[PDB]
Amino acid sequence: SHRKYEAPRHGHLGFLPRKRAASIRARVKAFPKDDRSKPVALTSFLGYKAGMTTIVRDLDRPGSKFHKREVVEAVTVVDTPPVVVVGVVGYVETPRGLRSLTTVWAEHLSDEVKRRFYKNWYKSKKKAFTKYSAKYAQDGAGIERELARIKKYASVVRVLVHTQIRKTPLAQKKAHLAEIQLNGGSISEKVDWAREHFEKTVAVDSVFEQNEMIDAIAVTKGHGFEGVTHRWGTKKLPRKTHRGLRKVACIGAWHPAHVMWSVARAGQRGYHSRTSINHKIYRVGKGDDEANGATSFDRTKKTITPMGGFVHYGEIKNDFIMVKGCIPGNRKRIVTLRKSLYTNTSRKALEEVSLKWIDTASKFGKGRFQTPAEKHAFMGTLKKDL
């Protein structure tokens, strides 16, 4: 039978598998279609979320209530350290497993990728890739020959890179090895691209342009073994009820005798990975880039450094990337970016940018003055300080 008539679903699930994040790296299984017309361009990227702010932008969109008015939403500025290519590995297709042997790394390895392999940094004798660095001493019979196979007996190329932590305020002291696929002309302009780009930073005058639809993948925050009550949505029994007042609703299944799949209770509300798409790049910033707070109303030289700090960060010392909208999953961990998969509907890329007033006040307390020099000037010389 039924109560009234079946009723909706508050115990409705959403993730068949799930589980706790046994790795800081998400599960990237989606890759854009390889194009031959467009030059060598990346498909994925790395970075770290900084936080959110309040940016005033003239709504060019023909709203049915606002339109051309001073309105605000919620955007994020993902920070990204100077990514340097230190590994060139190419592949072909994806049958039932990996299928290659042409793995080319580097020689000048810093103290960032040498900590990823070993938990105990002190026990490490700093002697990694010793048998690989000895191949550069000779003519290179096992190096240059490998590149001759990629130019013919290969297809896709996943460049192995990492993130600088020596200038990153994030207390981790370790780089993040990932895989980035690049699509360009033919199959020989893929391996030779990253080959001639050793010990180099991220260039914004080749691939990275203005207003590009990108994606965002981060890591979700968990809360322990949270039960059906808060994890899904269970009711609250009155105080008159005994032995419980917020316990799980009586299931009463049968449907096969093996109790159903969606009668779930306690597990892990969060601590996984998400996937966000359709995001336009507002402004590409750098590490030594000044005058970040370009206000088109007050005209004052200022940055976007948070006057308070969110949680586990710093005071902006790397290349920040301001993108449209926000991103699921908490920060303080590696965030794998991604370019456009294909000709998406978007239905919002028609509107460009119109950013003016940029917020840079307090993030820990209440929003007051944007610049600390303004408060000092309004106060003047008194007892303490100047």
């Binding site: 049915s64 209530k65 606002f66 008015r69 001073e70 309105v71 605000v72 939403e73």
Partner: protein
């Protein structure tokens, strides 16, 4: 929900459910307009669908006009007096509730409506903006 409104305005999540004693302050001589039915949605478990600023519901008359009782008449909320939901940041409110007089047909009747009237309902319903006075 389509009886002469300028598009579908942003349905703000207010706090006017079923059984809300609404007052009265306009050209009419009524004191309060008790509502016996508040809706404005569809498929939704458990919930009493509330009415945002600019919705057309049916209310009754208790105190004020004893001659017009136990009947159905339109009642569009002209006074929100509560924090709405926009994109600007601003969230100002009034004090007293709404309460207007309308003929049991599908339109309005009141004209000289005193008291502060929200600009949200004025933009949505042309009849409200045409029959008001003090806006915000």
């Amino acid at each position: 929900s389509g009886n002469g409104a300028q598009g579908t305005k942003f349905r703000i999540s207010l706090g006017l459910p079923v059984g809300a004693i609404m007052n009265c302050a306009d050209n009419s001589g009524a004191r309060n307009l008790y509502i016996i039915a508040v809706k404005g949605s569809g498929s939704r478990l458990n919930r009493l669908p509330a009415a945002s600023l600019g919705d057309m519901v049916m209310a009754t008359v208790k105190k004020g006009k004893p001659e017009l009782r136990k009947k159905v008449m339109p009642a569009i909320v002209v006074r929100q007096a509560k924090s709405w939901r926009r994109r600007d940041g601003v969230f100002l409110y009034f004090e007293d509730n709404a309460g207007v007089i309308a003929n049991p047909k599908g339109e309005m009747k009141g004209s000289a409506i005193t008291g502060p009237v929200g600009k949200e309902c004025a933009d949505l319903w042309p009849r409200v903006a045409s029959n008001s006075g003090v806006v915000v």
